[PDB]
Amino acid sequence: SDTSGDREVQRTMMQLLAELDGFDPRGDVKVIGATNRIDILDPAILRPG
């Protein structure tokens, strides 16, 4: 909290968590995520489901 470059990139993060599956399915994605470390990866992504 209290950042001016690490809060809007978290508010687009949150938007994803949350359009991927939620109210409305899936569709047929199956979203291939790719990253490097898990230590600059939010755990919400990193838990399976």
Place this chain on the structure above:
Amino acid sequence: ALNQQTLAIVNVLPTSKDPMVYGFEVEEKPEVSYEDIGGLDVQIEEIRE
């Protein structure tokens, strides 16, 4: 709702402004439904109450 060729009130329309996807939508369909109530049982019951 007005006839713009005369400028005169034709009908009166409900106040609602411009409501899109926003709040309007109501669904509830599968795969998460009220059959998918396997939890976390204490938590669910609290919501019903």
